[PDB]
Amino acid sequence: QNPMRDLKIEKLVLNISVGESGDRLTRASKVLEQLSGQTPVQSKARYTVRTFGIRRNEKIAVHVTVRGPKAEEILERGLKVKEYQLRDRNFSATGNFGFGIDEHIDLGIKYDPSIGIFGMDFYVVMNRPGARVTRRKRCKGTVGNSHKTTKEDTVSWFKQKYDADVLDK
Amino acid sequence: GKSHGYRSRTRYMFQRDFRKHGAVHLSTYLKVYKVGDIVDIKANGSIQKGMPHKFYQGKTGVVYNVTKSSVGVIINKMVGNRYLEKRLNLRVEHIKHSKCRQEFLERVKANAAKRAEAKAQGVAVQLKRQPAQPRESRIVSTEGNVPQTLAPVPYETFI
Amino acid sequence: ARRPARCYRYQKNKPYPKSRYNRAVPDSKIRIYDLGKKKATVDEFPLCVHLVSNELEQLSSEALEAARICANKYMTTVSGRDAFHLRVRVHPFHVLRINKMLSCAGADRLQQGMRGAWGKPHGLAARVDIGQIIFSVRTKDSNKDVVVEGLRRARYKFPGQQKIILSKKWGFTNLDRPEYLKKREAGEVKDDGAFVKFLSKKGSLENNIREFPEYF
Amino acid sequence: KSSAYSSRFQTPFRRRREGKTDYYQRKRLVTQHKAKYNTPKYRLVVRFTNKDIICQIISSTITGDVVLAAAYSHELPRYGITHGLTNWAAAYATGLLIARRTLQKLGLDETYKGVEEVEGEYELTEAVEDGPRPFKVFLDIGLQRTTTGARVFGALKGASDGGLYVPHSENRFPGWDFETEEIDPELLRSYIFGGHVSQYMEELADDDEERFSELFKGYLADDIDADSLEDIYTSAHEAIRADPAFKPTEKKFTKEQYAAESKKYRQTK
Amino acid sequence: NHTAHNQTRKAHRNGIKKPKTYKYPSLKGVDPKFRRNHKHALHGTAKALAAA
RNA sequence: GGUUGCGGCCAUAUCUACCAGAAAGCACCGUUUCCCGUCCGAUCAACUGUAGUUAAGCUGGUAAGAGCCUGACCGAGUAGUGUAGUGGGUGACCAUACGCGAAACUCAGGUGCUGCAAUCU
RNA sequence: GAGAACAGAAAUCUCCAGUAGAACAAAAGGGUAAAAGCCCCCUUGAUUUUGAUUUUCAGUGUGAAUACAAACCAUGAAAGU
RNA sequence: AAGCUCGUAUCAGUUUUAUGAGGUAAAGCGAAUGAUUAGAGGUUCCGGGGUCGAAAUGACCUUGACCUAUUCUCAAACUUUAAAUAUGUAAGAAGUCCUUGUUACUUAAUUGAACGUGGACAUUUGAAUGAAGAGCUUUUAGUGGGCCAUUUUUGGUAAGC
């Protein structure tokens, strides 16, 4: 077809939403220091509630963004956990998708005996080459509908890559 | 309690024109100002540092001092039974040159020219203005514009 | 504690409607402004009668109601409910005030004279002009004899000289009868539940052809 | 979108839509003390495309900015440089060129000579004694983020070293230690030349030799090795001191054959 | 309580007098940086005309 | 005429949907040794212009398009209004005389102009 | 608005729209979008000397503010403020 | 009241020409913010009900919501637009143009600023009308309860309020 139109992946996010700070969250941070090589960043909270018991400027969740082939590696070894199978609701209109997981040792990590068990969300976004023009400082410019990622582009890329099985239910 | 402030009665005075909010174009900051220049006053609320009082909005004055970012104008103010010189200091954002003089000066240029031209031409010239004199005679051709009779219309069929 | 209406007839004090500045206000006694066969097409009721004012005064919320009912019970009872469509055209937004020289409320004999004689609200009015509709009725050409008398019975319940007009217009349209037919035989007309939607010759041709396909 | 949105939308200015200028900055760079009535206020525009550099000297009118002198990096081949046209060293060279060009356009090339022997030192232009003052320009880095060790303060240095009094401080040059708050002139003299690239070159030439080729394929044209660079850029300097004048291209066509073609592609109404 | 009736008449009886501008007005409010130099300039011109 | 840098007037320049763009140019793009900043060389920094493209961005066309702009034998000399009368009228309000004079509607047409420098078959 | 395990109308995470409908200590009005708002870095121009001016006004005070000068400082790459 | 310096200046409760400011009257809300009557077209896995139901991210009625395209009526403390009247300034000799002197300010500069010398234009000396003179000073009296009429207008039902 053309180069500079295929949906090259850009990043992947590893969110963990605890609900409460403590050593719980440091054990939730020692889990990504090896799965990524990148020291995560702790999400402060934003609003208050009585049900969860949260308040502002409390670090109750962590996330980290990964790019390059490391994201591809993680997703390859994280989809075989899901038996490569995903659903249609998981795919957004904007052309990117995501899914959660519970057993963070399904990836095959050296289990340090103190971190225990806790889940983790993956959200994966991809776009065509040339979406710098939304980000750069000088001469920003939106992208055009002839170049814009869509749900149907996504599932097609996901049928070709990762060999099959989007549960288009 | 009655209020008497520096900006009372300015809900509609200093608020910008419709769809002209934001920064000031640079052609306020390049119009150069000398003393004697005759400037009209018009404030924008976006520039609070240098503002005039609501009185001097609309007025027209003569510059007498020129500093960084700012000028000084002499406006004469009626109060009671006389006028008073008011030497106020403004920023250049609340200002524009008056075009009355830019239209008078060209007229001086022109009448000086035809004065010096009439001395070469051997004729005398008028250069005082004169008002709208009455209309002179004429003959109105009736060839295609032959008059259409008119008459008042009624109320019936109109309502 | 109702004052008469002849005290609040003339448009004297500039309007004082319900707002954040005037929060506590009574509701009106007119709520229903639409009567008869509302959901009836503009085709059924071509004939429009109006009730116009000839002076500049103020109409009470209760008078508007009492004239409304006096016009309804007559038409419903001589012609029927599904014969006409009545629109009370004017809404009372002006608020009426009242001093209410209260002799008490807080201490011994209090609140006398007219220190602080601002008014407590006690009514709503409709400001009305020289040539302005109030009642707009829609029927066939076979029921003007009733509509006229229904309006003539109502003009007694509110003051002033109010003259009745038989409109050149079709229904509650702005167009005259034959112009409306020029448009209806043409495809310049489309129907809505309570009104019409004319066709334009400016706009998107696809969106203008989807609608009015009988045109083109 | 609805109609009441686009009825009320205030469009920003054209160049702010285009993202090409910051008027917050432009105001403060353009305005003058009104007591300096019609004296201009000269800027050093310096911009960084993907494979070219622009340097321009800009005064301001009401009917749009006026260019006194101009210097693009695509004319350094006249002085000897053929590669690395988007280079810290090239920026120094270009700044020096515009500097020397203007300073002889005015008649001040002899009086303010700059620094004809660089060491990487923080040296602002001084005024001559009982004689005309140095040319005072300022600097607008467009939208660029000021960061220590950027190409643009290279041209700041080049103009400063050519002579035309660009007031600045050192703490965005390279070699300036955040900790002790002082400068490293040796590293800066390196960066003036290929000091951050010759090292990469002569590192790959004994670490990874094919990728050295993939990148510096053109340095293997005239067999330009990673010690040739001092003698390249310094000859370029001396050449620029020598003949900085702008000798334009030859126009293959007289601007009308140029329009004659594109007019039959422009797709009129 | 503040009637302004009959003030304009009282003004206009003895008239509303314009301020009677002069040549060479005051220099109390101008930039002193300009004031000094003007003071030095005019003495020089006085001296230069003292000879010619 | 095209493009780029700086710009002036800041929608006739915007917004939405589609199509096209030779030249160079701009851009996207390619790598993290170094200054540098990021959790992430995504942004930002630096390096080569070498690997690859016109898909994007960008420019230009299109649309009984939205929007904006302009102007009228459109509305309307209507509404409003200054002055006057021992004018009308129970009054509210109204007319007349000498004068000024709108807006919304409706219709038609228009869709960026331009300054300095460089540069391109 | 579309999406992601527990996670629900609401924790966290991601994209698109988004002319301000948010925020700017406090009333109300104005003003503001590479900001005047949100986050961060450095800081003490909330300093010294005394004058001119605007508002209220008798063109007296008081209060508050405006624009310069001479010194010293901060900030910033710089203009500049 | 005493006058003083001058003698038709350059002044005026005025018009015109030119150029500015305003946000009231009116107008508008199928334009913003608010207020408001009506139905019709849709949308929901998502507010309630009803039938079919084991259930549904099931179907259909239905009322609520919002979304769309209209529709009726309004705003002293709403407004895109925007009058009338009233209002600021200018209409030359203290001017215009040329020349080139000063300065410690200003400029990259023999640049600019400000003030000047010496020249030419001095007649219609640069709109209308009028001018019973223009300008200036000192001093002191009484007053410092106000009422009425047209029009605009606030409270008040209203008032010879």
Coordinates of C-alpha atoms in Angstrom, one line a residue, chain B residues 11-144:
Chain B
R11 CA -20.4 47.8 32.8
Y12 CA -20.6 48.7 29.1
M13 CA -17.8 51.3 28.7
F14 CA -14.6 49.3 29.1
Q15 CA -15.8 46.0 27.9
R16 CA -14.4 45.1 24.6
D17 CA -16.2 45.1 21.3
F18 CA -17.9 42.0 20.3
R19 CA -15.5 39.4 19.1
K20 CA -12.5 41.7 19.6
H21 CA -11.3 40.2 22.9
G22 CA -7.7 39.3 23.5
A23 CA -4.4 40.9 22.8
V24 CA -3.8 44.2 21.2
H25 CA -2.5 44.2 17.6
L26 CA 0.9 45.8 17.3
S27 CA -0.2 48.8 15.3
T28 CA -0.9 50.5 18.7
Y29 CA 2.7 50.0 19.8
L30 CA 4.2 51.4 16.6
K31 CA 2.1 54.6 16.1
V32 CA 4.7 57.1 17.3
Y33 CA 3.5 60.0 19.4
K34 CA 5.1 63.5 19.6
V35 CA 4.0 66.5 21.6
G36 CA 1.3 68.6 20.1
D37 CA -0.3 65.6 18.5
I38 CA -4.0 65.5 19.0
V39 CA -5.2 62.2 20.3
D40 CA -8.6 60.7 21.1
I41 CA -9.2 58.6 24.1
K42 CA -10.7 55.2 24.2
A43 CA -9.9 52.6 26.9
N44 CA -9.7 48.9 26.8
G45 CA -10.2 46.9 30.0
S46 CA -7.5 44.4 29.0
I47 CA -4.9 47.0 29.9
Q48 CA -5.5 48.1 33.5
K49 CA -2.2 49.8 34.0
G50 CA -2.5 53.2 32.5
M51 CA -6.2 53.5 32.4
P52 CA -8.1 56.8 32.3
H53 CA -11.0 57.8 34.4
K54 CA -14.4 57.2 32.8
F55 CA -14.8 60.9 32.3
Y56 CA -12.0 61.1 29.7
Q57 CA -13.4 58.3 27.6
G58 CA -14.5 60.0 24.5
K59 CA -12.5 63.1 24.9
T60 CA -9.7 64.5 22.8
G61 CA -6.5 66.0 24.0
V62 CA -3.1 67.2 23.1
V63 CA 0.1 65.4 24.1
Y64 CA 2.7 67.1 26.3
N65 CA 4.9 64.3 27.7
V66 CA 6.3 61.1 26.2
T67 CA 7.8 58.4 28.3
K68 CA 8.3 54.7 28.1
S69 CA 5.1 52.9 27.3
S70 CA 3.1 56.0 28.0
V71 CA 2.3 59.6 27.2
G72 CA 0.8 62.6 28.8
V73 CA -2.2 64.6 27.6
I74 CA -3.7 67.9 28.5
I75 CA -7.5 67.7 28.6
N76 CA -9.7 70.7 29.6
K77 CA -12.5 69.9 32.0
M78 CA -15.6 71.8 32.6
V79 CA -16.4 72.2 36.3
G80 CA -18.6 74.9 37.5
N81 CA -18.0 78.2 35.8
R82 CA -14.7 77.5 34.0
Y83 CA -12.4 74.9 32.5
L84 CA -9.3 73.3 34.0
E85 CA -6.2 71.9 32.5
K86 CA -5.9 68.2 33.4
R87 CA -2.5 66.7 32.8
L88 CA -3.0 63.0 32.9
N89 CA -0.7 60.2 32.1
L90 CA -1.8 57.2 30.0
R91 CA -0.5 54.2 28.3
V92 CA -0.5 54.0 24.5
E93 CA -3.2 51.3 24.4
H94 CA -5.9 53.8 25.5
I95 CA -5.1 56.2 22.7
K96 CA -5.4 56.9 19.0
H97 CA -4.4 59.8 16.8
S98 CA -7.2 62.0 15.7
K99 CA -7.9 62.0 11.9
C100 CA -9.5 65.5 12.0
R101 CA -6.0 66.9 11.7
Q102 CA -4.8 64.4 9.2
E103 CA -7.7 65.7 7.1
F104 CA -6.9 69.4 7.8
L105 CA -3.2 69.2 7.0
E106 CA -3.8 67.7 3.5
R107 CA -6.1 70.6 2.9
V108 CA -3.4 73.0 3.8
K109 CA -1.0 71.2 1.5
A110 CA -3.5 71.5 -1.3
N111 CA -4.4 75.1 -0.9
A112 CA -0.8 76.1 -0.6
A113 CA -0.2 74.3 -3.8
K114 CA -2.9 75.9 -5.8
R115 CA -2.0 79.3 -4.3
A116 CA 1.5 78.9 -5.5
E117 CA 0.1 77.5 -8.8
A118 CA -2.2 80.5 -9.3
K119 CA 0.8 82.8 -9.0
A120 CA 2.4 81.0 -11.9
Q121 CA -0.9 80.7 -13.7
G122 CA -1.8 84.4 -13.5
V123 CA -5.2 83.9 -11.9
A124 CA -6.8 84.5 -8.5
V125 CA -8.2 81.5 -6.6
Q126 CA -10.7 80.7 -3.8
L127 CA -9.5 78.5 -1.0
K128 CA -11.9 79.4 1.7
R129 CA -14.5 76.7 2.0
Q130 CA -18.2 77.5 1.4
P131 CA -21.2 75.6 2.5
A132 CA -23.8 73.7 0.5
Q133 CA -25.1 76.5 -1.7
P134 CA -28.6 76.2 -3.2
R135 CA -29.3 74.2 -6.3
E136 CA -29.3 76.0 -9.6
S137 CA -31.7 75.8 -12.5
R138 CA -32.1 72.9 -14.8
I139 CA -34.4 71.3 -17.4
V140 CA -35.9 67.9 -16.6
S141 CA -36.2 65.7 -19.7
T142 CA -39.5 63.8 -20.0
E143 CA -38.9 61.1 -22.6
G144 CA -38.8 57.8 -20.8

